[PDB]
Amino acid sequence: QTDVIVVGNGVLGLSVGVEIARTRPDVRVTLLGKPARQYGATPAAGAMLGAFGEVTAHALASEHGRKKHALAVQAQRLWPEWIESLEATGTAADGRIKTADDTVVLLNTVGHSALDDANFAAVLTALKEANAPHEEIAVESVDWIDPDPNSRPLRALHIEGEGSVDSGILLAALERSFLQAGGRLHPVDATEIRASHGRVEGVVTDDGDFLPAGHVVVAAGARSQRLVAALPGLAHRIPRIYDGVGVSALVDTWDGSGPATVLRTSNRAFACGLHLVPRAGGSVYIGATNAVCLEPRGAASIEETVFLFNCATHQLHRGLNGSELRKVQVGSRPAPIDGFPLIGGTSVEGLWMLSGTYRDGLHMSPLLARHVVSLMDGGTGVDGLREFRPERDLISAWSREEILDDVVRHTMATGYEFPWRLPLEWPHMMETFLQGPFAELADRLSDTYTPPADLMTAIMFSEREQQDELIAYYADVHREWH
Amino acid sequence: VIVVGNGVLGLSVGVEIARTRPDVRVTLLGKPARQYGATPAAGAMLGAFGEVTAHALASEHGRKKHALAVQAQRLWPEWIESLEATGTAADGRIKTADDTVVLLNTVGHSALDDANFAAVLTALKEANAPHEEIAVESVDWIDPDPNSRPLRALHIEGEGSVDSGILLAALERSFLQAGGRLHPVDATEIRASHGRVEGVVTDDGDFLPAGHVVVAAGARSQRLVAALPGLAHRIPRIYDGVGVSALVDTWDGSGPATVLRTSNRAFACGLHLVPRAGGSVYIGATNAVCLEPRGAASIEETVFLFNCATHQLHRGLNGSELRKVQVGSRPAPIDGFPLIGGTSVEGLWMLSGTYRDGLHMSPLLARHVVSLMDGGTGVDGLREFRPERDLISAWSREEILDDVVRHTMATGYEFPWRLPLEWPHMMETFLQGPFAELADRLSDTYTPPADLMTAIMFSEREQQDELIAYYADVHREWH
Amino acid sequence: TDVIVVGNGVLGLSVGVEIARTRPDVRVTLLGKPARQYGATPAAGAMLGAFGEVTAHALASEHGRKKHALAVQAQRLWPEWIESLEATGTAADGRIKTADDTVVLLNTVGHSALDDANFAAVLTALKEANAPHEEIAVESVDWIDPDPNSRPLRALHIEGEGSVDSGILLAALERSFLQAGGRLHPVDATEIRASHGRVEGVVTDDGDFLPAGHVVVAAGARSQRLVAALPGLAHRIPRIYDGVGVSALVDTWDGSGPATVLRTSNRAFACGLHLVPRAGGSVYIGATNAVCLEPRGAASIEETVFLFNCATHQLHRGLNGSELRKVQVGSRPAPIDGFPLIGGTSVEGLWMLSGTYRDGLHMSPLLARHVVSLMDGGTGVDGLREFRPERDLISAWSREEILDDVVRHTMATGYEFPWRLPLEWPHMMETFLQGPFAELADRLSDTYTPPADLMTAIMFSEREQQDELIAYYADVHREWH
Amino acid sequence: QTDVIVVGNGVLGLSVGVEIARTRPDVRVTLLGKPARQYGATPAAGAMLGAFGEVTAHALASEHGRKKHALAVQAQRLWPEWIESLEATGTAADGRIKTADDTVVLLNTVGHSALDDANFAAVLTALKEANAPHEEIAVESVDWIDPDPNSRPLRALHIEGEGSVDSGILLAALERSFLQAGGRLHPVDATEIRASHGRVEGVVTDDGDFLPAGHVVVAAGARSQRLVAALPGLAHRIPRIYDGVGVSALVDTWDGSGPATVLRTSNRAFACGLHLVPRAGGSVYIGATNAVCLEPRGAASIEETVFLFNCATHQLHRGLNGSELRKVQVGSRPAPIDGFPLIGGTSVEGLWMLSGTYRDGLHMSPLLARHVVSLMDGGTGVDGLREFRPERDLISAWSREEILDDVVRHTMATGYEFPWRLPLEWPHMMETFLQGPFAELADRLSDTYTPPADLMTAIMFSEREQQDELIAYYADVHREWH
Ligand SMILES: Cc1cc2nc3c(=O)[nH]c(=O)nc-3n(C[C@H](O)[C@H](O)[C@H](O)COP(=O)(O)OP(=O)(O)OC[C@H]3O[C@@H](n4cnc5c(N)ncnc54)[C@H](O)[C@@H]3O)c2cc1C
Ligand SMILES: Cc1cc2nc3c(=O)[nH]c(=O)nc-3n(C[C@H](O)[C@H](O)[C@H](O)COP(=O)(O)OP(=O)(O)OC[C@H]3O[C@@H](n4cnc5c(N)ncnc54)[C@H](O)[C@@H]3O)c2cc1C
């Protein structure tokens, strides 16, 4: 078989589907997944084409973080022609994929100085290093915003050509473009990848059918590693992916207005963040919470909804307070256990993975699609994706000391972002008493691996049985690679 | 007989007519969407003593409404038996709790919460109702923020709750079993000539003939009848008391054994948790009088409801899964009292304007209207709440002006705000003049209750002017 | 026969008055300066606190129940004691008594684990004692005008539990002491002189030597440091630390004041909120408490803000616009083992009256009469024997009880602020506080556990101060076992 | 007589006393006032040598405000030689008048955007227009400060050569310098100025004595107009001066440290503000509240102490929380009813006034002293100070509309500076309901005069009898000058 099966109907599966179908007109490409898109990250996304907006001091302090950032900057260059190529298969009445061209990053004091001040400086430095067009602007010159004065920004940064897409219109344009290129949509889920003699044979679907293929591309979001891990040896050779459960909302604004740009903060405690993405027709998207969950979750918590709404109404626009809630959206960011994506080939011939993209898979989609298609055609794809090969020992991108400093800072940031009001001795007391328990957990989990802060907090507050199972997992991975 | 409306009141009267007049054809109108429907957004509490306020019981009309709530409570056990009888085990149980605990905390105005707790205690003793003031430590399940915790608690025996969804299903099933016909269209127009109902034009363009039309269309009820000659200024207006509630799957699948509630709070909102089967709880409920209907929750309503429940009832709700935000319109009568009974048009009846407690009163109200339709006198104390009336003036302008300022201040204390200590007295002083000026400008004789007065204060000048005209036309009609 | 009383607070002056009145055979000299450096008494309201001072934690220990019984006994002495002190003065000297009754308020600006438990404990103690009291409607509490979000929802009227003006009390004690033939010598003791196991007298800070057959040490928080210089007494007299307390005198906006004491139960680390009536359009508001390992004679910013914020929200918003006349600071003598030091020593003629913490002023007439009885060869008051100053440290609670208490009191500092936090934070803080306090308690000593008020001070002290206390506890164990 | 009596022993009386004594060695100069300095502004001052730091958008929007600012810049140039001349009369052990050379202005969000953002921009503009040395600096580069992250600054401005003096050391140096120049200190208060045939005869003192003089200089702070108003016709010809009651504190810092510069915000609601002025010997000065009172007050309110302490501990240094309170200080800023100082001569020969300087008489003192001494010697003194002659119709420096906008903004700023936490609809509700009552008060007080916002709020919350007496005062002033 020269047949291709793409497992997954999010932005990544559809993007790779479109690129395969367009580049290999001679081959059958079939894409699996259902219109419900259960736990789907893409439909819950605003979405920001986040490159410079996603910069943190912590990410850029590591070689792996600098490599991930370079790929985000490369992906941004592909978006204008990618959108042109997808809108080309449609008409005016399909709507516009692009909802804003530019982003304003706001700096307010509703957060930790150790995150927000460090991250604002890191964004400014990254923009200058990349020769990207940008301007620090007067807050008074920021269009539309009407914050609570006690929650207001005092600095603002205009990022030119860093925009947003309507994630729903993007998915519709990708499906339309996939069909135009001769792709076939089969609305079932893969249950099992079939392989023997180190080669893919095809996919068993959840209706009990078997589909043969020479190539299987796994882009099933947070389910991607669980699907591949069933193959021989791969349980401790493919890094685990967890559910980065994210809550967002669609709001009909009081007057039908919206901002001309994305409005956002830098990434905040445990990779949450505040942003507003413009939409057509008097709607705005507000996001977005983040919680790594050891099992998937398909509903928003009360706490997530209150935090998102409170941040947006105070820090962006008080008019949102009186605005109508249209939809609370929940999706799972694929959260890799070592903090880096799983992109490329396996020890199994014709088996490819595109997953573990967490906050910025949608942004990276055109670059990731082209990378995997290049590899499938015997090329080397995009330089600097090599470290993010899916079959690997867990990456250790930071020292245990760096992660322990980070997890305590992020824990304290949950207070400052609330924002809390406490006696002034309490924060220093909590900082001192948080250090020991996180140090003890990190030392107990493994002699070699340290989970990033976002996962470490989830493990700290999980059941003893869940902690013990992860100790076993890390020990089995060490055994496999050392 | 045509019943217009498929909420608790329309279906309850439909069931009572169908069961009592097997010789007559009874058709009930309304759609499964139940647009703006109050009943499906209700918990619901069978609220009698829990609904007591000092302000309500200070007026004759308020004391009359309370007496009817106490009477209605006695009908519920046999009413539920009669509705469950038409179903099987798999249909679920209408009753979700037998008892209520009222909590007193300091996340509110002393001028409402302290006065209302005393009024509830007095009303229970006056009625010889079974109840006990209990230690807060003895209230099962609750886990409040210590800064938001109750310091007093009141156990009300035999004041419980129903699943409003299971009630609606049981009413529809019981209606069909009694030979009622469900026609899933809306009435557009009531047809009448020579002072008699002819029937109803539906929104599919059809005409249904009838000798009797019962209007139970919730917040749409007066707008529907007001098109008939002279009735525009003879049937009190009904507005949308937009209410937000939520269904939450609890973190551990647990729930309280009783209703948990505060007394009624600023502008007839209030905090309660109603138990549900299957690891779900109902939390409610906000209230905002809107001059035009609204079918979606505001961000502000969702945050206030969630913040109150997580702090004052159970911090575990914070980590619990949001299943559904519900929005419905409490039918809010302009004079603060229900519209129940006959009209100057033969065969035209109304059951509406029940605001917070139509669902609780439903079996009593249904039996009252059915008695009237059969030539009886129904229930003694409902006469004052006849739908064709001059607007009731249940309070002095002075009482309402004191109340609207107190309720305005209570929106601060219920938040709860943190302000410099001179600000509250400053705001109290500067609120008095503008509300006095509005009340004096609206009418020489009528004063809207606080819940509506705040909505009018913050409405457009054109909406205020239209109400000035309405009140003047009502005065002209009745005086 | 010469007697020297070292200290010019309520306890020194009360014992001075009782000796001078009772012992025509003795010349009695009282030392101490009008500045009353670190003086607890002048910073006190003061409440005649017996039932108001009840906590669940105090009454859960035998030692705590014994201390409470003595407070109830002391209350009965006050009417005749005041009569006897005012008798030596005229109308123009003012009235010692400022209120007859107390209202205890319960609000939610605090930890349920302290305030709810303590309100129940006060109610139980009143009923057990058959003391006159009534739970009253909050609406019936005169004068108060709280923030609605800080308001009480329960109130308790305690009949015959009142207050005195601490300044007028001190003036009446000095005047009564002089009338009875006592001599006031306004210098400080630097050294107690003893040889052949007997007191010889006192070296004063002007370099003089005063001979005496009897020396009574009532020098507040300085009492143990003064006696500890004598042979072996460093590990035989329990340490007394400074329970630094801040209070204020406020001239009310309209010159009004409440007719009763207004108070909460005792709150985090033995602080609490109260208003004590004063004459002439003044009110006393108090009072903060922080155990300090070294003395401190000035209020911190944090103490002033906390006291003022509590009083303006929980008692009367009118205090916000009222004039601040005086911020007062004094040291409650805080015994390391949580119980007073009252009676005789292994040194003939050496006596101690100290370590009374929150309620030495209330207990003063009873404590004074006890020590004077002992000095005259009597047995004084039954059940004050257990509080003899020369003792092994008392262990009135298990390590487990104290560790539960210190975490609860730590959390209460948050709820009393009151803080506003994400709802998961309190449980997180409770979990992460347990280990560090357990580790400290285990490191300090195998046998002794400091009470919560001192344990928090030690937790946040320098490593050198912690190490010195480890050595102290080890030297005490060595001396007594 | 050619004798001079200076009435008042604050910075202005002593500064003019020193200048008279030094310039007229042939004349007897006697200075009245007691060491208690009842209601004294000077001893309660930090004090900042505030020129650019005192800039507000509102002040610089009026001609009179721009004139006052020019005089502050001129006064700054005199301080170095003035201090040299005062320290010259002392020895090393008397200590140093100057406590800092430079100022950092901080911008945080614990206040109204309508004051703090507008005022920060106005300070920056005034510095650039004056070609004054200054730099916008990174907040991370501000030494010493340790704010609550939720109360932290996000912008900071370093003003070179704008410093501070120890007000206590200044007063001691002025008294010593006055004696060195042949001045006599008489520690009694003036009760009555004696004048007949349009000429001063001298002063009756509160010990019942009479002191003859050819010249009487009234520099009695907030008591200055009440003292002169007893003379014929002067009740409606000398603008009233009220008590701008100000609370400040001396704190011994936890570690004996202090900042190297003044730390301040711009002027905030009703001319209060937050600042820390360095002192020698492990002490810092924190200030300062401001409340116009229609009668003098010599004690801090609970509210004033809490607000000052809460602002300093959160916005400047959390270490102040655990620091020892040494002294709460209270003084009366002389608050002129028309918002401008009273400096120069009267219709009574030999009668002079130096008062109504509100926030910046201490800073202006060397310039004001030299101006009045020039006038007494038949000169014209300093060009722009003629407009602030004490015998005048009330100045109307702003429209009624401007003042009504200002009073509502300042009222709302008392909320944001607290900072309050309120439902988001409440601020707009309060703004709407404040407008009518202030408009009604302004219209009722006078057809021609409008009190500035600081006084208008005091009048709004005064007794009906106090409002009626001011209506009569304004009517009598109109009658006198029209
Ligand atoms: C948030 C919330 C909480 C509540 N909680 C309680 C509680 O705890 N206890 C309690 O007793 N009650 C509660 N209630 C309800 C209260 O008692 C109401 O007064 C009562 O539900 C009114 O019922 P109704 O049948 O008159 O109106 P609805 O329940 O609104 O029913 C009217 C129906 O008529 C339909 N309709 C409208 N126009 C037409 C037309 N032209 N033709 C046909 N159909 C039409 C509507 O779509 C709707 O389904 C609550 C309500 C809300 C919103
Ligand atoms: C803020 C506050 C509030 C209080 N409120 C109350 C209350 O409501 N009710 C209550 O009953 N009690 C209250 N107290 C006081 C409490 O009861 C104390 O335990 C009691 O005052 C202790 O009295 P004392 O005489 O032992 O000590 P102090 O009152 O401290 O007297 C000791 C005196 O001895 C002097 N001295 C020290 N060293 C020497 C020396 N070497 N030579 C000579 N003299 C020396 C000191 O300068 C001082 O004047 C309060 C205390 C504080 C600080």
Author numbering:
A (entry chain C), D (entry chain B): 10 to 491
B (entry chain D): 13 to 491
C (entry chain A): 11 to 491
What does the primary publication say about this deposited structure?
Here, we report a noncanonical FAD-dependent enzyme Orf1 that adds a glycine-derived N-formimidoyl group to glycinothricin to form the antibiotic BD-12. X-ray crystallography was used to investigate this complex enzymatic process, which showed Orf1 has two substrate-binding sites that sit 13.5 Å apart unlike canonical FAD-dependent oxidoreductases. One site could accommodate glycine and the other glycinothricin or glycylthricin. The resultant product is no longer sensitive to aminoglycoside-modifying enzymes, a strategy that antibiotic-producing species employ to counter drug resistance in competing species.
